[PDB]
Each structure stands twice: as structure tokens, then as C-alpha cells.
Amino acid sequence: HHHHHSSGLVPRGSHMSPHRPILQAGLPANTTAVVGSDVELLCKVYSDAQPHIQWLKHIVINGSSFGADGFPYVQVLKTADINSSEVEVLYLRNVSAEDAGEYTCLAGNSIGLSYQSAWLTVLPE
Amino acid sequence: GGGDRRKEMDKVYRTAFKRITSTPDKEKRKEVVKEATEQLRRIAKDEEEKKKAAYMILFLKTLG
């Protein structure tokens, strides 16, 4: 087997190669909200190399989140140059029916780009 | 097929990501994005790679 001092991520500047960012499973999570309330989506990004954060919202046109060609309608909400030592947050204040749909968190470094998604459901009051 | 496609798409990302984060000249960044866009749409065949191509272009386009 393999015996090392740490089973965590490879330290920055080590003989081990760096990897693409790792997004923790379950974040963002599918949340449900009532109109007018505030919603916060999380995204825990692990990375040795510097990653850039990006939040998108999937846009629906004619009942479809994809174009006639097949590329997704997405809207850039937030970007960041470095990941946090805590967590990444997307603040959705005073949510309405139009805020519902698919939200995607993205983190990419010198190696790759990783992305996870979640669905926000908005119910009436 | 699909495996060789995603490997080719990763090479385009790393090559583009290295240039955007290196020079701050917005004109040179737009040229690498344009170049990365043309190669990425040619490799993409199914919906998983098309969404992945769209995601990477916007990631590099909005890179600080």
C-alpha cells in the first residue's frame, strides 16, 4: 500500500502533480424557498493551485435551457480570483419565481475546471 | 472517442488558462479566447461536452 504523512491534498509546490479543484459533494444543495425570503448557496472548493470561482444561473427560453444548437443559456452572476479558506457563498435576496431554476458553481485552475449544480424551487407565500 | 475528446478539451483549457492569467492586455486575452472557442466547438459532439465547452469559454472569458 501507500504510506504518507498526510492523506489530504498534495501541498503546493510538492513533487506530486497538482490536480483540478475538488468541489465537495452536496454543495450547492437543492433548496426550496418562499417568495420574499433570502437564500444562500454554498460551494466548498479544495485546491492546491490557485482556483477561480464562478457562479452561473441557467436561463430558460421557450421552455428550454439550451439553444437550437445545444449550448446552455447561462448567466454569469459572480466571479472570484481566489477560493476561500472557508466556503463560497451566493446570496439570493428577496427571491421570486424567476429566481428558481438551476444554479452552477465553477472552480478552475491551471489543470482543469470542475463544476457542480443545484436547483432552487420557489413556492408562493 | 469520448475519452480522447475530453483529453483534447483539457489541453485547450490549460493552454488558454496559462495565457489569460499571464498577460493582462485585454486584447491578447480576447485573441486566446477566440482561438480556444474555435477549437472547443469543433471537438464537442454531445450535450455533456457542449455544456463543458460553454462553461470553459465563459470561465476564461470572465477570468480576472
Author numbering:
A (entry chain A): 229 to 353
B (entry chain B): -2 to 61
Lines quoted from the article behind this entry:
The design of proteins that bind to a specific site on the surface of a target protein using no information other than the three-dimensional structure of the target remains a challenge. Here we describe a general solution to this problem that starts with a broad exploration of the vast space of possible binding modes to a selected region of a protein surface, and then intensifies the search in the vicinity of the most promising binding modes. We demonstrate the broad applicability of this approach through the de novo design of binding proteins to 12 diverse protein targets with different shapes and surface properties. Biophysical characterization shows that the binders, which are all smaller than 65 amino acids, are hyperstable and, following experimental optimization, bind their targets with nanomolar to picomolar affinities.
We succeeded in solving crystal structures of five of the binder–target complexes, and all five closely match the corresponding computational design models.
